[PDB]
Amino acid sequence: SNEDLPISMENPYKEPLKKCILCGKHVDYKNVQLLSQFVSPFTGCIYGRHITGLCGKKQKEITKAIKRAQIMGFMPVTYKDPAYLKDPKVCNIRYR
Amino acid sequence: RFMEPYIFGSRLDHDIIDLEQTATHLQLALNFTAHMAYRKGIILFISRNRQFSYLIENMARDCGEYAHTRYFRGGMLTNARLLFGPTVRLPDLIIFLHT
Amino acid sequence: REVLQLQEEVKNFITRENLEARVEAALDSRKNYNWAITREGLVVRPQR
Amino acid sequence: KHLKFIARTVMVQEGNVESAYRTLNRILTMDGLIEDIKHRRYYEKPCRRRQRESYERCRRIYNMEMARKINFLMRKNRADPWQGC
Amino acid sequence: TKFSIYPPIPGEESSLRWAGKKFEEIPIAHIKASHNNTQIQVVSASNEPLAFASCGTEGFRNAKKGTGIAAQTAGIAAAARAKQKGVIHIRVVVKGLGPGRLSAMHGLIMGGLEVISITDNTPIPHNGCRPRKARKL
Amino acid sequence: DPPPSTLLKDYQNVPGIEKVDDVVKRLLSLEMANKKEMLKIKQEQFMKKIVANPEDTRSLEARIIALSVKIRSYEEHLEKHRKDKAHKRYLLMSIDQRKKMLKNLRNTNYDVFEKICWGLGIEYTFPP
Amino acid sequence: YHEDRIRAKFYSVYGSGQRAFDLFNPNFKSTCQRFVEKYTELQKLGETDEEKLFVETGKALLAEGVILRRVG
Amino acid sequence: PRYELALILKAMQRPETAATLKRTIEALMDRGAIVRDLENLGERALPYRISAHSQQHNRGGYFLVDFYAPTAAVESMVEHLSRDIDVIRGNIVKHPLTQELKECEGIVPVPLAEKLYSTKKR
RNA sequence: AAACUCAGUUGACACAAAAUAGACUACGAAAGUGGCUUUAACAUAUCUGAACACACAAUAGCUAAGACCCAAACUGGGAUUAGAUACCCCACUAUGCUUAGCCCUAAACCUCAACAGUUAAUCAACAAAACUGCUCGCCAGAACACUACGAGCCACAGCUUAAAACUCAAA
Numbered sequence: 020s021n022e023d024l025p026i027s028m029e030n031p032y033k034e035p036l037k038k039c040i041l042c043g044k045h046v047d048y049k050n051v052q053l054l055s056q057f058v059s060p061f062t063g064c065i066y067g068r069h070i071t072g073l074c075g076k077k078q079k080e081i082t083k084a085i086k087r088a089q090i091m092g093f094m095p096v097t098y099k100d101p102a103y104l105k106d107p108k109v110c111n112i113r114y115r
Numbered sequence: 116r117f118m119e120p121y122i123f124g125s126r127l128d129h130d131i132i133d134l135e136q137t138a139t140h141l142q143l144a145l146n147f148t149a150h151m152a153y154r155k156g157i158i159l160f161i162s163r164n165r166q167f168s169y170l171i172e173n174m175a176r177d178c179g180e181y182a183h184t185r186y187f188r189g190g191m192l193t194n195a196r197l198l199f200g201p202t203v204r205l206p207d208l209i210i211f212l213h214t
Numbered sequence: 215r216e217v218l219q220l221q222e223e224v225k226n227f228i229t230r231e232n233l234e235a236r237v238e239a240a241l242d243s244r245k246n247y248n249w250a251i252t253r254e255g256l257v258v259r260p261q262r
Numbered sequence: 263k264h265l266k267f268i269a270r271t272v273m274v275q276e277g278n279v280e281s282a283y284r285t286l287n288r289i290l291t292m293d294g295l296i297e298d299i300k301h302r303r304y305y306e307k308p309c310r311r312r313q314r315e316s317y318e319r320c321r322r323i324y325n326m327e328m329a330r331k332i333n334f335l336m337r338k339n340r341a342d343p344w345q346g347c
Numbered sequence: 348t349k350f351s352i353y354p355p356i357p358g359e360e361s362s363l364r365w366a367g368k369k370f371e372e373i374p375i376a377h378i379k380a381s382h383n384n385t386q387i388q389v390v391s392a393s394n395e396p397l398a399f400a401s402c403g404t405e406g407f408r409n410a411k412k413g414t415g416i417a418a419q420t421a422g423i424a425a426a427a428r429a430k431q432k433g434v435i436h437i438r439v440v441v442k443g444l445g446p447g448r449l450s451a452m453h454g455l456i457m458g459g460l461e462v463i464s465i466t467d468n469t470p471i472p473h474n475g476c477r478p479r480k481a482r483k484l
Numbered sequence: 485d486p487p488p489s490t491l492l493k494d495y496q497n498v499p500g501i502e503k504v505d506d507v508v509k510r511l512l513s514l515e516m517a518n519k520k521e522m523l524k525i526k527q528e529q530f531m532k533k534i535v536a537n538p539e540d541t542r543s544l545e546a547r548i549i550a551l552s553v554k555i556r557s558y559e560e561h562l563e564k565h566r567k568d569k570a571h572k573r574y575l576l577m578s579i580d581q582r583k584k585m586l587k588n589l590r591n592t593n594y595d596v597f598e599k600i601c602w603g604l605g606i607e608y609t610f611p612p
Numbered sequence: 613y614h615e616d617r618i619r620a621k622f623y624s625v626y627g628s629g630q631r632a633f634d635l636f637n638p639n640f641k642s643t644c645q646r647f648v649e650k651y652t653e654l655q656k657l658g659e660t661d662e663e664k665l666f667v668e669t670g671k672a673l674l675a676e677g678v679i680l681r682r683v684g
Numbered sequence: 685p686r687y688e689l690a691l692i693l694k695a696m697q698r699p700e701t702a703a704t705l706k707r708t709i710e711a712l713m714d715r716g717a718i719v720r721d722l723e724n725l726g727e728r729a730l731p732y733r734i735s736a737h738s739q740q741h742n743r744g745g746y747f748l749v750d751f752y753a754p755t756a757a758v759e760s761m762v763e764h765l766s767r768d769i770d771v772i773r774g775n776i777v778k779h780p781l782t783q784e785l786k787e788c789e790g791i792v793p794v795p796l797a798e799k800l801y802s803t804k805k806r
Numbered sequence: 807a808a809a810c811u812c813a814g815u816u817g818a819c820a821c822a823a824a825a826u827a828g829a830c831u832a833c834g835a836a837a838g839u840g841g842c843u844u845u846a847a848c849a850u851a852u853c854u855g856a857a858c859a860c861a862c863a864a865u866a867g868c869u870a871a872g873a874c875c876c877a878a879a880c881u882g883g884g885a886u887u888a889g890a891u892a893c894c895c896c897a898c899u900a901u902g903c904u905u906a907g908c909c910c911u912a913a914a915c916c917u918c919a920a921c922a923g924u925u926a927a928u929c930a931a932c933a934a935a936a937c938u939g940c941u942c943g944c945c946a947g948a949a950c951a952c953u954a955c956g957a958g959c960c961a962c963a964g965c966u967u968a969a970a971a972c973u974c975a976a977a
C-alpha cells in the first residue's frame with residue numbers, strides 16, 4: 020500500500036517507571052542503618068508508604084526487616100538509633 | 116464513542132481526525148448548505164463558543180443569513196409559535212460551528 | 215556451574231580441623247552490614 | 263528497658279519552653295501517638311474500629327479527589343477574556 | 348554550629364553544659380498528669396528524690412485537683428522545694444494527657460527552675476491490657 | 485522414605501556428581517534439604533516404578549502418583565498436627581480427587597489402573 | 613512510525629536542543645528531524661547497526677554544524 | 685537448608701568469647717550442621733537492656749554463623765541456645781541470600797477504581 | 807460519695823494482649839487470619855454436584871483441669887431515687903486465655919449460587935451496568951410459624967427439618 024500508514028509497535032517515547040529508592044537492592048534486618056532511615060527519630064514509628072515513597076513490596080520488606088531487627092536485638096524499638104540520625108533524610112516528613 | 120469511525124488514530128494520547136472522511140463529509144455538508152441557500156432557505160448558525168461568537172455573527176451578517184451564538188433560551192425552536200408568533204418561519208437549516 | 219562453585223566454596227568452610235583458627239580470625243575481623251540510601255537511590259557506605 | 267531521654271525528647275532552644283512543648287506536641291500528633299493514647303482510653307470494638315477505618319479511608323480519598331478537582335478547575339477562574347460575548 | 352532539638356547522646360563528647368554539668372547529670376522532673384490529678388516528683392540524676400508535690404498535697408480536693416491552676420500550684424511548690432535543695436536546671440519528663448500537663452510545667456517554671464529538655468513518656472501499650480468499655484450516657 | 489544421602493532430583497543427572505567431595509555430597513543430599521525435595525524424589529521413584537513413560541507429567545498416571553505423594557505428606561503432617569483442620573480438609577479433598585482420578589483411569593485403561601493400585605498400594609473401593 | 617524509535621533515542625541522548633519548534637511553519641524541520649533524515653539516509657547507504665548508525669549520524673551532524681549537546 | 689544464626693553473646697574477654705563461639709559451633713556440628721562462615725559484627729551496646737539467665741546486659745557481641753543444617757536439627761539448636769549461659773540471645777533464620785531478589789519494574793501508577801457506580805445521573 | 811493507705815521515681819517481672827507499618831487489600835473453602843523465628847503446609851487445570859454423606863464453622867454456651875494482667879455479664883457496695891432498677895463510680899465472679907472434648911447458632915451479608923461467555927442492540931424502581939448458556943439448591947398471598955407434632959443430634963429452657971385448623975383482602 021503506502022509506507023506512510025502508521026505501523027503497529029509499542030511506545031518508544033515511554034519513560035521508565037519511577038523506581039523506588041530501594042528497588043533492586045537487598046533489604047536485610049542486619050542493616051540497622053537502612054531500617055532506621057525509615058523510622059521516626061522521636062517515636063520509632065514505622066513510616067507509611069505515603070511518607071517513605073516506597074512501593075508495596077519494598078514497604079513490606081522494610082516493615083518485616085524492622086520487626087525482625089527489633090525483636091532480635093539489632094534495632095531500638097521506641098526510638099531511632101542516635102548514631103543514625105545523621106543519615107540522609109529520605110522520608111517526606113517535616114516536624115518543624 | 117460515536118466519533119470512533121471518523122478518528123484516523125491516536126498520536127501520543129491525542130486523537131487525530133481522519134481528513135479523508137472529513138473531506139467527503141465536508142463536501143456533502145457544503146453541497147447541502149449551498150442547495151438550501153439556493154432554495155432561499157433560512158440558515159441559522161449556532162455556536163456557544165464565546166471566543167468565536169463575534170466572528171460567527173459577522174459571517175452570518177455578511178452572508179445574508181442568521182446567527183444565534185448567545186444563550187439559547189428554552190424553547191426557541193419547539194415553542195417558536197409562542198415566543199415569536201404563530202406565523203413565524205423556522206430555519207430551514209441549522210449549522211453548528213460548535214455542537 | 216552451581217555445583218562447581220559449591221566445590222570451590224566448601225574449601226573455605228569451617229571444620230573441626232580449622233575451628234580455632236577460623237574462630238580467632240573472626241574475632242579479630244569485623245563485618246559491617248550497615249549502609250544508607252540517598253534520595254537519588256545511591257548507596258552510601260560507612261567509614262571504618 | 264530502653265535508654266531514657268532519647269525517645270520523645272525535645273531540647274529547649276534559648277529557654278522558649280512553650281515553643282519546645284508545642285514542637286513536641288506537634289511531633290506526637292504527626293506520629294499519631296496522641297490518637298493512640300486517646301483512643302486506648304476506652305476499648306473500641308473491632309466492628310466499630312473497622313467501620314471507622316473504612317470511613318476514614320473513604321473520607322481521605324474523597325477529600326483528595328475534591329481537592330484535585332478544585333485545583334484542576336482553578337485555572338479556569340481567570341478573568342473573562344470574551345466579555346460581551 | 349546550630350541548635351539541635353535532639354538531646355545530646357550519653358557517653359558522647361558533647362560540649363553543651365548547664366551550670367557546669369552534663370545532660371546526664373541534670374536532675375529529672377517527672378510529671379504524671381492523670382485525668383483528675385497532677386503529681387510532680389523531682390529526682391536527682393541518680394534517682395534520688397528531692398521534691399514531691401501534687402494537687403492533693405497542695406490542699407485542692409476532688410474536681411479542684413483536676414484543674415490547671417492546681418497543677419500550676421503544685422509545680423510552684425515542687426519548684427520551691429527543689430530550689431531549697433539546690434536544683435536550678437531540670438529535664439522535664441511528662442506522662443499522661445491530663446489538663447495540667449502543660450500548666451504544671453508553667454508552675455515548675457515560675458518557681459525559678461529552668462527546663463532544659465521536655466520529654467514525653469506517656470504509657471502507650473502497643474497492645475496490652477484491654478481497656479475498660481466505653482461509657483454510655 | 486528415600487535415604488537421606490540421596491541426591492536431589494535437580495542434581496542426579498549432573499555429570500561428575502559422584503566424584504565430588506563428601507561435604508559437597510551431603511550439601512546436595514536430601515538430608516540438607518526440606519521435605520519438598522523428599523516428596524519429589526518419592527514421586528520420581530514411583531513414576532519410574534509404575535508408569536510406562538516417566539517423561540509424561542500430564543498423563544493421568546503422573547497426576548495420580550503426585551496426588552498420592554501429596555496424600556502421604558498430608559497424612560504424615562496430620563500424624564503430628566491432629567488439630568490442623570485445614571490440612572485435614574486438604575487430605576480429604578485430595579483423597580476424593582484421587583478416587584475420582586482412579587475411577588477415570590479404571591474406566592479408560594484397566595491394566596495401567598491395576599499397576600497403579602499395586603504400586604501405590606491403593607485399594608479401590610466403590611462408593612456406597 | 614519507524615522514525616519514532618530514532619526520535620526517542622535522539623531525545624534521550626540530547627533532549628530538545630536550542631532550536632525551538634516553529635510549529636506554524638508547515639515545512640519546519642527540527643534538529644531531531646534532521647537527525648532522523650541523516651539516520652535514514654545512512655541506513656539506506658548500507659549500515660545496519662543501531663549504535664553505529666546513531667554515532668555516525670551524530671558525527672555527521674556535528675560536521676554539518678549541528679550543536680548536538682549530549683546530556684549523558 | 686541454609687540458616688543464618690544471629691548470636692548476641694555476653695560481653696567478655698577474648699578467651700571467654702572464643703570459648704563460647706567454639707562451644708556454639710561445636711554444638712551446631714554435633715547436631716549435624718556444616719558451618720559455612722563465622723562473621724563478627726562486633727561488640728556494641730544493645731538497643732535495650734536484655735536480661736538473660738538472671739543477669740541484665742547492656743552491651744554484647746554480635747556474631748553471625750552461616751551454616752547448612754537439616755531442618756529437624758534447627759529446633760534442637762535453639763534449645764541449646766536457650767541453655768548457654770554466655771548467650772544473651774540467639775536467633776536462627778532462613779538465610780537471606782537464599783531468597784531471590786525478584787525484579788521490581790517500579791511503582792506502577794494504578795489509579796482509583798473506575799466504574800464503581802452506574803451511569804444514570806445522580 | 808464509696809474504698810486504698812497508698813502514691814511517685816528506679817529495678818526485677820506473664821500461660822494476657824499483639825502500637826506504628828496498614829493511606830496496604832494480601833492469605834484461606836467459609837468462619838476467619840495484622841508481634842518474631844523455625845518446621846510442616848496452602849486439593850484438582852478440564853465444569854456442575856448434598857434433607858443424601860464426609861469435614862469445617864465467629865461470638866456466646868456447656869464439661870473437666872489449669873493460668874490471673876486487664877476486661878467483664880451476675881452480684882455486692884457507692885451515689886441517685888419516695889423506694890427500686892438502668893446509666894455513672896468502686897470491688898469482684900462466670901467468661902474472654904491454655905489443654906481435651908462438646909454445642910453447630912449469626913445482619914455466618916459483596917444481603918447479588920457455581921462454571922463459561924458477551925458488551926451487541928441498556929434498563930420497572932433502588933442497589934453493585936445489562937445479559938446469554940448450563941447446572942445444583944430454593945420459592946408459590948399474608949399471618950399462624952426461627953411454632954406444634956414426628957424424626958435426628960454428646961444436644962435436655964437446645965439445634966436442624968417443618969405443618970395444620972381458625973382468620974384476613976391484603977401483606
Ligand code: FES
Binds near residue numbers: 040075
Ligand atoms: S519501585 Fe521497584 S520494588 Fe518498588
Ligand SMILES: [K+]
Binds near residue numbers: 824
Ligand atoms: K504489635
Ligand SMILES: [Mg+2]
Binds near residue numbers: 855
Ligand atoms: Mg465440585
Ligand SMILES: [Mg+2]
Binds near residue numbers: 856
Ligand atoms: Mg453444601
Ligand SMILES: [Mg+2]
Binds near residue numbers: 863910
Ligand atoms: Mg463454633
Ligand SMILES: [Mg+2]
Ligand atoms: Mg469458650
Ligand SMILES: [Mg+2]
Ligand atoms: Mg478489673
Ligand SMILES: [Mg+2]
Ligand atoms: Mg462476616
Ligand SMILES: [Mg+2]
Binds near residue numbers: 919920942
Ligand atoms: Mg453451588
Ligand SMILES: [Mg+2]
Binds near residue numbers: 952
Ligand atoms: Mg434461631
Ligand SMILES: [Mg+2]
Ligand atoms: Mg424449634
Ligand SMILES: [Mg+2]
Ligand atoms: Mg419435638
